[PDB]
Ligand binder design. Structure first.
Ligand SMILES: [Ca+2]
Length: 176
């Protein structure tokens, strides 16, 4: 067996292709940041369907968090999470991102500071003639009994930004 054989298989995938999927997500919190109005909605132009978070990040502190969540029935079986964040590549965008996730019940914080990035060096991707900074997040965690929902924490670190941020391609994997 090749040493690069994937030891995992895709158990759950959310690509936000339909706006109905957004109704399954909710905002589960803020700290030193705010949501706008509405807090979340669907966007059909980014990632051919993405979760749009309308955020207000003052960029004054090193942890400015907005958080969203969704139930996942099979989550206790899983050990790897991947997801993408896209931020409009607007003039002057500067700062650090500290994205992570939470398994719940149990409020189990996973991948803390495991996927940090300077926004100014992040990959650029284009959708519909517009540029985005891309942040791919990959988090490893233990099979955890009783967990039923996943929270995605989008955390700014002196990243002043008022506008939409996007989440896409939420994928959960279990070991074979
Ligand atoms: Ca998508």
């Amino acid at each position: 067996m090749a040493s690069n054989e994937a030891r995992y298989v895709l158990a759950e995938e959310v690509d936000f292709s339909s706006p109905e999927e957004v109704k399954n997500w909710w905002n589960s919190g803020t700290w030193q940041a705010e949501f706008g109005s509405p807090d979340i909605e669907w966007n059909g132009e980014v990632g051919n369907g993405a979760l749009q978070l309308n955020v207000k990040l003052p960029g004054k502190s090193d942890w400015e968090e907005v958080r969203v969540a969704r139930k996942f029935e099979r989550l206790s079986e899983c050990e790897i999470l991947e997801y993408d964040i896209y931020i409009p590549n607007v003039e002057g965008l500067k700062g650090r991102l500290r994205p992570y996730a939470v398994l719940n019940p149990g409020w189990v914080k996973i991948g803390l500071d495991m996927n940090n990035a300077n926004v100014e060096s992040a990959e650029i991707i284009t959708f519909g003639g517009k540029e985005y900074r891309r942040f791919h997040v990959r988090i490893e965690f233990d099979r955890t009994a009783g967990v039923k929902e996943l929270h995605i924490g989008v955390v700014g670190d002196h990243l002043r930004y008022d506008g939409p941020i996007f989440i896409d391609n939420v994928r959960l994997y279990k070991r074979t």
